[PDB]
Structure formats: C-alpha cells, structure tokens
C-alpha cells in the first residue's frame, strides 16, 4: 500500500507498547505491593520480589584503611580490581577487565570459578604483588541468600549464565577453593551484589545516597531499609540493612500480564531461562535489542518490512544488539541516517527502503521509551518505600550511560510518581562497584 499506510499498521501493532502515566502508576503500585510481601516471612515464598537482605547494615563512611582486591561478575564485563583506602585521601585503585569465553559461562561451576582465579593470578603477578595477603570483595551480580556477608548462596542464574554446579551452592566457598588451588593468599571474601556495591560507592561520596540502581545488561535496585521490617533477617540489633530487591523477577507471578505484549512473550519463550525475570526483560540492555528484532521478524512475515524478506543475520538470535538502539536514537524527523546505516551495515539487510528505516526507528523508540519509563516507575516505588525526604540515587549500566534520552525519560517518570515532598537526584557511580565493594570488604 502507501508507505504512509504501511507505517500506520506499525503504529497499530506497536500500540500495546504505548503505556500511559496511569499504567506506570499501577506497575509501581503492584510492585510496591510485592516488595512489602517479600519482606514478610509468611509471604516471601509467594512473591516474585525476593528482597534478599544483604547484611550490609552500615554504609562505608571513608575512615576505612587498608588495601583490598575486588572482583566484578555478571555485568557487561569482568573487572579485576585492587583498592587502597586510607580515610585521608581518595582510595587508590588499579584494575583490569578480562573477557570470559562463552563456554566458561555454561560449563561446570568449578571451571568458571577456576577461570576467575586463573585470571586474578595474572593480575597479581603482572602488578608484582602476589605473595601479599588480601581481602577480596566479590561483586556477584546474582540473587543470593546472604547468611552474613561472607556466606552467600546462589538462588538462580539470571542473564546469560547457566554454569552447572553453582546454583544452591555457597559461591564464596567456590571462589575460595579455586583461589586456594592457585596458591593465592586471599584471606576473606565478602559477597556483595552489584546494586549494593553501587549504593556503597555512592554513599562514600554523597551522604544522602540511599539507593543503588543498575540499568545495564540487567536491571535491579538496592536500598537502605528498616531492619525491623526485614523479617527474614530475624530480630536484629542495628537499625538498617541494605536490601537487594532483585526486581528483575517482577511479573513472575502474573503481575505484569496486562502490559506484556506478544513480542515480550516470544522473546521470553526463546530466552536462556524462560519465564524468569519478566520485568527485567522489558527493561535491561541484554533484552531490549532482542525486542526490536522480534518486532521486525514479525513485521517481515506480515510483509510490512523488507518486502517480506528476512536477512540471514536477523535469523541468528542476538544479531540485533541493543548497542544499535543507541545510534538509532539520535535520528531527527526527516533523517533516518543512523537507522539506515544499521539495517545495511550492522545487519547487512540486502535491499532497504525509506519506509523500512522509518518503521524500524519507530520500533526502537517504542521499545526504548517504555524501558526507561519502567525503571522510572521502579525508582518512584523505591522512593515511596524509603520515604526519606532527600534521596540520592546511585546509577550504573550501559542503558543509563550510552543511551540518548534514557535517563532523560526515566527521571520524567520518577517525577510524575515520586512522593511530592521527596527531592531526589540520579548520581552516576563513576568508579563502579569496585571502590564500593572494597570499603565493604574493609569489615567483611
Ligand atoms: O546486573 C544487574 C542485575 O542483573 C540481574 O538482574 C541479576 O539477577 C541481578 O542480581 C543484578 O543486580
């Protein structure tokens, strides 16, 4: 039909993505309903939002002294760090990022945990500081049942991991074993989640930071809570504890069933761990690109794109990276240059037309717009829980960093839903979870 006609079809199909402020008020409303259920013993096991207490009760003040190691696992890239704190000056740091072989993440646990040690050792040798004894802060980006900071148990693998022999085990001991099998003098290991690590890096700088948001390969938030409410923590002594919400799991009990579309379902169905992390799959960087691919492939079989031809590339899963959604977003009205280049250059689509470019940039915008707003609802929900009148939020993640308009839009959503008397501000966590995990390690 007319190009205009074809475009109007794309609008009608992608309409279920065009959510209203009222929709978000509700997601947020239902979300908050789940978090308070997860803090309750009689209702945690029937809630998707686990609210795992991290046992980090008091955030690092800066007086911490010493030199510690710090690993980062789960995020976009494996960082091996070394921190020196003296409170005093700014914590000295040194670091590396090691690529991990695709196999390592799906084979045996001992094999992955062996790789971890294999790697750290190199760092220690090259920097000429091996025999020195340390205290490692392990930022393990996954849901774990914390039994104190040192003993952490994997609940389940999220994201792109599926190593056997890890789930249900104490990860700190796994690492500690392999470290020993490499003659490395690694005394302690504090297991901290990335959100928790972020909240710490953030508190160390800003005294008002009570939240740690991660919007990268995956989404999750952590916040300071009243330890009188964290029932699974038992009758404790300190007033507070950093809670690892692990909200990626929202929707796992049918809470987002009215807002999830067919693209969300066929993307989910075909994912690594089907049916798990339903809210995350609508928000994070590992899945947003896959959403536009799914829409496309659908649009192509309806003859609404590429005259019905699907390119070899877009047949392979993850062939349409979220990174593309970055350049595509800088496109003005009468200007589909970045979109165009993407179809032809990154995806090698054979024959491409203006309608295709236009249709595709709209698919991106839709997906990316709802993504930000969803995280935004979530922070508005946290702010409604924390209740403090001045909340500094520590952020991190490719989405926040590399995406034009992401934080720009997220904030607008937190703005329509935050407590009218709360003043908040997103403060990017520049030095990562490393500097934050090390201060935590300083006590272990
Ligand atoms: O990377 C951020 C988040 O990714 C996934 O959601 C993990 O399950 C979660 O533990 C982590 O915090």
Same domain, 273 and 135: no
Binding residues: 72-77, 141, 158-159, 193-194, 219-220, 246, 280, 285-286, 322-326, 398-402
Ligand 1 neighbour 72 (Cβ under 6 A): no
SS3 283: helix
**Nearest atom of ligand 1 to the alpha carbon of 218:** 4
Using only the alpha carbons of the chain, give its radius of gyration.
Answer: 22
Ligand 1 neighbour 139 (Cβ under 6 A): no
Ligand 1 neighbour 218 (Cβ under 6 A): yes
Ligand 1 neighbour 285 (Cβ under 6 A): no
188-198 exposure pattern, b = at least 16 Cβ within 10 A, e = fewer = bbbbbbbbbbb
- CB burial of residue 214 (10 Å; 0-12, 13-18, 19+): buried
Same domain, 104 and 226: no
Asked whether 40 and 230 are in contact (CB, 8 A), the reply is no
Q: 182 C-alpha to center of ligand 1: Å?
A: 29
Contacts of 433 (CB under 8 A, 6+ apart): 70, 72, 139, 192, 194, 197, 198, 200, 201, 396
Binding residues for ATP: 72-77, 285-286, 322-326, 398-402
The whole-angstrom separation of Cα 363 and Cα 304 is 13
Same domain, 218 and 281: yes
Ligand 1 neighbour 398 (Cβ under 6 A): no
The whole-angstrom separation of Cα 238 and Cα 292 is 47
* Closest residue CA from atom 5 of ligand 1: 218
Same domain, 49 and 108: no
Contacts of 303 (CB under 8 A, 6+ apart): none
The tally of CA atoms less than 13 A away on the side-chain side of residue 246 is 31
Same domain, 420 and 290: yes
Contacts of 401 (CB under 8 A, 6+ apart): 216, 428
The whole-angstrom separation of Cα 258 and Cα 321 is 27
Catalytic member of 50, 104, 114, 159 = 159
**Which stretch of DSSP H or E encloses residue 118?**
helix 109-126
Same domain, 395 and 408: yes
Q: Strands 151-154 and 144-147, how do they pair? A: antiparallel
Cα–Cα nearest to 221, from 233, 236, 209, 229? 209
Residue 397 phi/psi, 5° resolution?
Answer: 125, 140
**Which stretch of DSSP H or E encloses residue 73?**
strand 66-73
The whole-angstrom separation of Cα 211 and Cα 380 is 11
- Identify whether 133 is a catalytic site residue: no
The whole-angstrom separation of Cα 412 and Cα 426 is 12
Asked whether 433 and 194 are in contact (CB, 8 A), the reply is yes
Q: Which of 200, 246, 437 gets mutated to test ligand 1 (max ligand atoms within 8 A of its CB)?
A: 246
**Which stretch of DSSP H or E encloses residue 374?**
helix 354-386
Ligand 1 neighbour 217 (Cβ under 6 A): yes
Q: 309 C-alpha to center of ligand 1: Å?
A: 36
Sequence positions preceding breaks in the chain, C–N over 2.5 Å: 87
Listing DSSP states for 405-440 in one string gives THHHHHHHHHHHHS-TT-EEEEEE-TTHHHHHHHHH
**Annotated resolution, angstroms:** 2.6
Cα–Cα nearest to 156, from 148, 164, 144? 144
Cα–Cα nearest to 88, from 429, 442, 444? 442
Tokens coding 441: 């390690």
SS3 35: helix
Same domain, 308 and 377: yes
Residue at token pair 């008020």: 25
At 128, which CATH number? Answer: 3.30.420.40
Tokens coding 355: 């309608």
The whole-angstrom separation of Cα 336 and Cα 227 is 52
Catalytic member of 135, 194, 331, 431 = 194
Within 181-320, strands assigned E span 186-192, 209-215, 219-226, 240-244
The tally of CA atoms less than 13 A away on the side-chain side of residue 25 is 6
Q: How many domains does the chain have?
A: 2
The whole-angstrom separation of Cα 261 and Cα 17 is 7
Same domain, 368 and 381: yes
At 46, which CATH number? Answer: 3.40.367.20
The length of the chain, given as a count of residues? 444
- CB burial of residue 182 (10 Å; 0-12, 13-18, 19+): middle
Helix axes of 109-126 and 171-180: crossing angle, nearest 10 degrees = 50
Question: Residue 196 is part of which domain span?
Answer: 54-204+431-443
Tokens coding 283: 């928000």
Same domain, 248 and 375: yes
Asked whether 71 and 120 are in contact (CB, 8 A), the reply is yes
Q: Which of 140, 166, 220 gets mutated to test ligand 1 (max ligand atoms within 8 A of its CB)?
A: 220
The dihedral built from the CA positions of residue 258, 260, 261 and 266, taken in this order, carries a sign that is negative
Asked whether 393 and 410 are in contact (CB, 8 A), the reply is no
Longest dimension (CA), the chain: 72
Asked whether 105 and 112 are in contact (CB, 8 A), the reply is yes
Q: Strands 186-192 and 240-244, how do they pair? A: unpaired
Asked whether 281 and 271 are in contact (CB, 8 A), the reply is yes
Ligand 1 neighbour 153 (Cβ under 6 A): no
Same domain, 25 and 161: no
The whole-angstrom separation of Cα 430 and Cα 61 is 18
DSSP letter, residue 108? B
**Nearest atom of ligand 1 to the alpha carbon of 195:** 12
Q: Which of 54, 75, 214, 278 gets mutated to test ligand 1 (max ligand atoms within 8 A of its CB)?
A: 214
Cα–Cα nearest to 352, from 369, 364, 340, 370? 340
The whole-angstrom separation of Cα 243 and Cα 195 is 9
The dihedral built from the CA positions of residue 263, 266, 267 and 269, taken in this order, carries a sign that is positive
Same domain, 41 and 60: no
Asked whether 20 and 373 are in contact (CB, 8 A), the reply is no
Q: How far is CA 102 from CA 74, 156, 160, 367, in A?
A: 13, 19, 9, 27
- Identify whether 159 is a catalytic site residue: yes
Same domain, 155 and 10: no
Tokens coding 143: 């849901």
Asked whether 76 and 402 are in contact (CB, 8 A), the reply is no
Ligand 1 neighbour 197 (Cβ under 6 A): no
Q: Strands 92-98 and 151-154, how do they pair? A: unpaired
């Amino acid at each position: 039909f007319s190009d205009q006609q074809l475009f109007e079809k794309v609008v009608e199909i992608l309409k279920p993505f065009d959510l209203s402020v009222v929709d978000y008020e509700e997601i947020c409303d239902r979300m908050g309903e789940s978090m308070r259920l997860g803090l309750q013993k009689s209702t945690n096991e029937k809630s998707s939002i686990k609210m795992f207490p991290s046992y980090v009760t008091k955030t690092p003040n800066g007086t911490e002294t010493g030199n510690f190691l710090a690993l980062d696992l789960g995020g976009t890239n494996y960082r091996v760090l070394s921190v020196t704190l003296e409170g005093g000056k700014s914590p000295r740091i040194q670091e590396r990022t090691y690529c991990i072989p695709a196999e390592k993440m799906s084979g045996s646990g001992t094999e992955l945990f062996k790789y971890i040690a294999e790697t750290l050792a190199d760092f220690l040798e090259n920097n000429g500081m091996k025999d020195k004894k340390f205290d490692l802060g392990f930022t393990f980006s996954f849901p774990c049942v914390q039994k104190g900071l040192t003993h952490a148990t994997l609940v389940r693998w999220t994201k792109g991991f599926s190593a056997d022999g890890v789930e249900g085990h104490n990860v700190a001991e796994l690492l500690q074993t392999e470290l020993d099998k490499r003659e490395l003098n690694v005394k302690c290991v504090a297991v901290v989640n990335d959100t928790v690590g972020t909240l710490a890096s953030c508190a160390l700088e800003d005294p008002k930071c009570a939240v740690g948001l991660i919007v990268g390969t995956g989404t999750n938030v952590a916040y300071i809570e009243d330890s009188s409410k964290v029932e699974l923590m038992d009758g404790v002594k300190e007033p507070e504890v950093v809670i690892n919400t692990e909200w990626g799991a929202f929707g796992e009990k049918g809470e987002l069933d009215c807002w999830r579309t067919q693209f969300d379902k066929s993307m989910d169905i075909d994912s690594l761990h089907p049916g798990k992390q339903l809210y995350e799959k609508m928000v994070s960087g590992m899945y947003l690109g896959e959403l536009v691919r799914h829409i496309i492939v659908y649009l192509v079989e309806q003859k609404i794109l590429f005259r019905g031809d699907l390119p070899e590339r877009l047949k392979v899963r993850n062939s349409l990276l979220t990174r593309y959604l970055t350049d595509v977003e800088r496109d003005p009205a009468h200007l589909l240059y970045n979109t165009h280049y993407m179809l032809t250059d990154d995806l090698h689509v054979p024959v491409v037309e203006p309608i295709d470019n236009r249709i595709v940039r709209y698919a991106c915008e839709m997906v990316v717009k709802r993504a930000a707003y969803l995280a935004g609802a979530g922070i508005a929900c946290i702010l409604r829980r924390i209740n403090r009148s001045e909340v500094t939020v520590g952020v991190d993640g490719s989405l926040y960093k590399f995406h034009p308009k992401f934080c720009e839009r997220m904030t607008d959503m937190v703005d329509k839903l935050k407590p009218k008397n709360t003043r908040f501000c997103l403060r990017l966590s520049e030095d990562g979870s490393g500097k934050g995990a090390a201060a935590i390690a300083a006590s272990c």
